Amino acid sequence: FEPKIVGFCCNWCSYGGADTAGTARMQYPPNVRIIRVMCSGRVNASMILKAFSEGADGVFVGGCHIGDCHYDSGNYKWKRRARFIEDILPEFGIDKERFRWEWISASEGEKFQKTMQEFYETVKYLGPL
Amino acid sequence: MEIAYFLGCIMNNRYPGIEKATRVLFDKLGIELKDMEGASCCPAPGVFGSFDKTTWAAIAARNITIAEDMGADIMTECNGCFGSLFETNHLLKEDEEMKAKINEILKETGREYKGEVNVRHFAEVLYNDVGLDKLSELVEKPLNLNVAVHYGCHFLKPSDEINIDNPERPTILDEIVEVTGAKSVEYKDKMMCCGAGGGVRSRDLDVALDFTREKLTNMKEAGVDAIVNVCPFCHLQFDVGQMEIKDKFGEEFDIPVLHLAQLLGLAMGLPKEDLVVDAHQVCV
């Protein structure tokens, strides 16, 4: 079983974190697919639900550390949305461990690598959705 | 309040007056001292930590498990015993494989280390749980004494783990001493080691006695009347090494050695018999 994982990362820190992990040559499983947004505040529950309905076995969202958002306060709004999404998902048979959201700074390549590896292990252990 | 009472070796086997004074003081203060039945050497870090870390850690873990079975935190009035027990406690608490090894050793004794209690120093307990105001209220007669405070190395160091007071210029023991009316006199190299730790006293007595002689020379030109310590291992070093220095080099230091508990008892008007100054080789 090879899970399908979709990732959303903000342009300024989390996408920068993935770039840092890449430049440092930090290996991690190739299942994740990153989609760029300017801010984590651009992400809403419709995208997560569409990803899960289209065949995704896990959804990751990466944002700036609270207080480090380029756009000042988008990540707060995303955090609220993410808590509500964790509330909603289990009602339709989707474990909330399949939906992970983390704060990754532009220089935190190693944290991004570890997050990717651990999320892949979790989703694979859960099995197909 | 109830706290487990760890005696060690020197206090209960060479200088029982310190133990008697501690018991009387803690009874007066309203703190119950619970005896750690079956306790052994902590074991003294100098020899056992230097020879085999596993044996030292296992013995200290058994000592800690005694207090864990009583539910209470350990209180110790020896710098060496405090260092040994405190170091073993943080190592096992923050190290799972070492904890597993120590528990595998301890299984034969029908004991298991759980990391449930804290190791505390007599002076730290007096400063925090009691406070200086309560201690002052218990002073029946202020003392007129110039005393040299010997902090000892293992009371405050390694300070990253202990976090009691600044190891370079501490003040806790000075304040506890001065609530009694005694004046804590500054002297050169106040924070120097007494020379007894690390097994040096039994390995090279001359070097340890040189440590003690330098400290005594500094205290004497400071013009002090007594030495106050919170370590029976430093207490023994000073007391017995004064006579050893007298016999070897003929230098005559006649500075009495008092534990902090004994000084507090003197300031609290305890019987002269309870201090057991007869055990001291240097006349008080």
Binding site: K4, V6, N11, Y15, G16, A18, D19, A21, G22, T23, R25, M26, Q27, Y28, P29, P30, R33, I34, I35, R36, V37, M38, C39, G41, R42, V43, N44, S46, M47, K50, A51, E54, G55, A56, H70, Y71, D72, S73, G74, K77, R81, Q113 | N166, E168, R169, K188, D189
Partner: protein, 643 residues
């Protein structure tokens, strides 16, 4: 939509892990793609020429590039397409190097599949892209320089000589910075004031420079070319326009207070002039010490004393900002083993600089704080406040070695009989002439070097000081007596640095100093456009390095002001009035207040909007949509990622 796909080998950086043949072949076969090509280095001139030729010939209206991260080369390919006529926002970037090839080396097949999926997502997004004309905004041809030290003075003079009107805000009553406090400079031992004072006078006289001393920057708003700055001028209680700096008020004043210029070892009056070469040469009254005796008021002939002065608020509009706020000297009081503040005859390097200066408090005589007598034995301790994890200072201060050696040489020059010893770990004489200066310290002046970080400094009853330290090259402990001990304190960010950093909105480096845009190639730029760094504001360094940085910052700030225009990105919210219901759950979500309500419909201000997309994500009905990040585009990308 005619999509042209360009997969970059990047040499072997993508090619070595990902098959740039199988990936180009898929792109040619994907719907709407009319060309698929691969080139070894697309960002290079030949690659851009290939892209332009393809656009011109095949009439491509969408360009997709499978190359490194967009954060690196998106502007490059955007200006490429335009020179060939396409709109910049019709182009898409697929990240297959940092996200695919450099992180899945052990899975080449999975890497190729991921590259295929990523290119599919990129083409899915590119299908729905539309042209967006970007708006130009004028760049004000004015500069602000914060800090009146050598670096700030250099930057202001360079900008003013290039023709730009410059403001210089300085928190102290006079400019000069720390260079004015030095007696001599290494490695030449020339007088610092003799060469700095002409520059200070130049700054004070320049037609293109507005000098605002005794003032602080309170608020900064706006962006490059369009900075609105609110400055607070503190009350001198002396009229700058009237005061001539004669100093009679100082003569008559009865109150004595420390002189900040003398670094705690010099005294002046409640009304004071920091030093004779001050610019502006004006008096200042410190009300913490003034008793309002009006003696200065009576003795002044210009009527320059104003005891009822109030703080003034100034508002300026500038195009660029240069931060040149310098540093403070490390306070070694926390190093208890060295006894600074406790031992009488322990001083710092900057205090020694003030004491050796002829105009200093002691008239240039190095005297013991205890007795007023010259020390016969002097020790210097290196790396105080630096290279020390016990105090969280793991960096080198980069100048303490050289100024320690310089002050030892000066003490030898003034008092040849004095014995001087330096306690060092490394001698970092890295600069031009620095190694020769280091050798001259030994050969000519007979200064003694001990390789050992002192363990302790002990004050003896007679107030002499025993340094207890290992001589590691002799491999033995030493306890040497000295009449004076000088701590080689390091450099730290100045007091109030965090307040100004938050006011402007800059980041800081691990050492606490301000962070440059790129460590190697943009040393004086910041990631905030229109803001630049000069001098020790960016980190410890000596005077020539700070001057070079100031000149470079002047050039970099002049570039955009010469251009006179900057482009605004058009990734902004747009409201569909026919769909919008005026629910208004979007207005409060904009931190910049870009959204208002007109005619019962949401309306976005382009100038205020920055393009976060929060409001668009919040809008339930979808009336709000972000340009270049539309909901349909992201939905198509999600669909393509899994299908």
């Amino acid at each position: 939509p005619k999509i042209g796909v360009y997969v970059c080998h990047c040499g072997v950086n993508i090619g070595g892990v990902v098959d740039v043949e199988a990936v180009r072949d898929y792109a040619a076969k994907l719907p709407n793609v009319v060309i698929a090509k691969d080139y070894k280095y697309y960002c290079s001139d030949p690659g851009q020429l290939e892209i332009q030729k393809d656009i011109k010939e095949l009439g491509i209206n969408r360009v997709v590039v499978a190359a490194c991260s967009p954060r690196l080369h998106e502007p490059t390919f955007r200006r490429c397409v335009e020179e060939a006529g396409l709109n910049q926002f019709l182009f898409e970037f697929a990240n297959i190097r940092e996200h695919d090839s450099w992180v899945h080396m052990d899975n080449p097949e999975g890497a190729t599949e991921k590259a295929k999926d990523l290119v599919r997502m990129a083409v899915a997004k590119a299908r729905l892209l539309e042209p967006l004309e970007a708006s130009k905004v004028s760049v004000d041809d004015k500069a602000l320089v914060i800090g009146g030290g050598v670096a700030g003075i250099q930057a202001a003079l360079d900008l003013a000589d290039m023709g730009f009107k410059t403001y210089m805000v300085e928190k102290r009553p006079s400019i000069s910075g720390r260079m004015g406090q030095l007696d001599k400079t290494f490695p030449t031992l020339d007088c610092s004031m003799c060469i700095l004072a002409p520059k200070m006078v130049d700054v004070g006289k320049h037609d293109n420079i507005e000098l605002i001393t005794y003032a602080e920057v309170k608020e900064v708003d706006g962006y490059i070319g369009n900075f609105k700055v609110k400055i607070e001028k503190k009350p001198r209680y002396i009229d700058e326009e009237l005061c001539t700096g004669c100093g009679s008020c100082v003569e008559v004043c009865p109150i004595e207070m420390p002189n900040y210029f003398d670094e705690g070892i010099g005294m002046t009056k409640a009304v004071y002039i920091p030093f004779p070469q001050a610019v502006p040469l004006c008096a200042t009254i410190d009300k913490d010490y003034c008793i309002e005796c009006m003696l200065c008021d009576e003795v002044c002939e210009r009527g320059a004393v104003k005891h009822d002065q109030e703080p003034e608020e100034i508002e300026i509009e500038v195009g660029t900002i240069i931060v040149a706020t310098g540093y403070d000297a490390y306070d070694p009081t926390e190093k208890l083993e060295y006894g600074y503040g406790r031992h009488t005859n322990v001083i710092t390097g900057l205090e020694l600089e003030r004491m050796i200066n002829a105009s200093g408090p002691t008239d240039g005589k190095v005297l013991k704080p205890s007795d007023g007598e010259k020390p016969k034995r002097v020790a210097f301790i290196h790396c105080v406040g630096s290279r020390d994890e016990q105090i969280g200072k793991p960096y080198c201060s980069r100048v303490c070695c050289m100024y320690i050696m310089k002050n030892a040489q000066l003490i030898k020059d003034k008092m040849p009989d004095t014995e001087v010893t330096l306690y060092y770990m490394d001698i970092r004489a890295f600069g031009k002439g620095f190694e020769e200066f280091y050798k001259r310290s030994q050969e000519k002046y007979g200064i003694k070097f001990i390789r050992g970080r002192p363990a302790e400094v002990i004050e003896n009853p007679d107030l002499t000081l025993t340094v207890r330290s290992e001589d590691t090259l002799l491999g033995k402990v030493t306890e040497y007596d000295y009449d004076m001990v000088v701590l080689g304190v390091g450099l730290v960010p100045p007091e109030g640095a965090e307040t100004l950093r938050q006011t402007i909105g800059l980041s800081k480096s691990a050492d606490g100093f301000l962070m440059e845009a790129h460590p190697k190639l943009r040393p004086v730029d910041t990631l905030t456009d229109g803001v630049y760094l000069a001098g020790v504001a960016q980190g410890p360094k000596d005077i020539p390095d700070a001057v070079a940085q100031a000149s470079g910052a002047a050039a970099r700030a002049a570039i955009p002001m010469v251009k006179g225009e900057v482009e605004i990105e058009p990734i902004i919210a747009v409201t569909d009035s026919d769909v919008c219901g005026g629910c208004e759950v979007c207005i409060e979500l904009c931190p910049f207040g870009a959204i208002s309500i007109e005619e019962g419909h949401a309306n976005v201000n382009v100038a205020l909007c920055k393009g976060c997309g929060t409001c668009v994500a919040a809008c339930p009905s979808g009336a709000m949509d972000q340009q270049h990040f539309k909901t349909e585009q992201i939905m198509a990308q999600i669909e393509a990622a899994l299908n």
